[PDB]
Structures are given as structure tokens and as C-alpha cells.
Write a protein that binds this DNA or RNA. Sequence first.
RNA 1: GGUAAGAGUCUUGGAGGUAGAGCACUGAUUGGACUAGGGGCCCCUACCGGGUUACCGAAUUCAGUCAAACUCCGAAUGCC
Length: 52
Amino acid sequence: RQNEYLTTRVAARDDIWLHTKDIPGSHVVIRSSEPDEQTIMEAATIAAYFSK
RNA sequence: GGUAAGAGUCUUGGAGGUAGAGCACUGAUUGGACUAGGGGCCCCUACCGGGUUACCGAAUUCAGUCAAACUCCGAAUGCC
């Protein structure tokens, strides 16, 4: 219920959206125009921590 | 006591909105064009807008209804 609202209302364009491959997990979005490689790594670790 | 006014009928002139009719007002309404505005869905909304709505209906309009506290009208009888 938070995820559909976050994906369709909150985040604008060119926001990197992250999810675990073929495993259910939290939906993680970075609200910046350009994501730094370190930012992508950190958000991927957060998405992996909040996963199965 | 006044006295012959009283009453009925023919003729004439009036006031007063009932029966009936009608939307010319006040409401309630049914259908079609007309669509102010609101409803989902795609481009997009971090937000302005666009499309389709076999989607509702405040306006307005062609029609169709209704009304003791609606009347543009309007009797028969009663009344003076």
C-alpha cells in the first residue's frame, strides 16, 4: 500500500528504482536526478537487507 | 303604530376566483438535443493540459405531466 503510492505519486522521473532479482523485497527509490555509484551500492545494500 | 315597504318571476348592471381548464408565475417533475461543472483509464501530475466517456446532471431550450396554501383564464348557481 505504501509501495504503489510511492511508485505512482512520490518519485519523479530519472529516479533509480531498486528491487531484488526474482526474490520479494522492499522497493527502494533514490530521489535525485543522477545517482552516484556509491549511492546505488548503498541503496542496493538497503534493498538486500530489507528482503527475504 | 307606519301604512303597503316585504317576497317570487322576466329584463338590466355589478362585486366576489369555486367547478373546469392551463403553465402566464410558485413548487415537484418525465424524455431529447444541449452540455457549467464533477468519475475511471493512457501521454503525463514533481503540475498545466489533451483523448475516449454508450458515466451523472446545476444553467438554458423543444416537448409531456401535476398542485388546498400556483393562476394568463374562468362558469353554472348563489349575493347586492
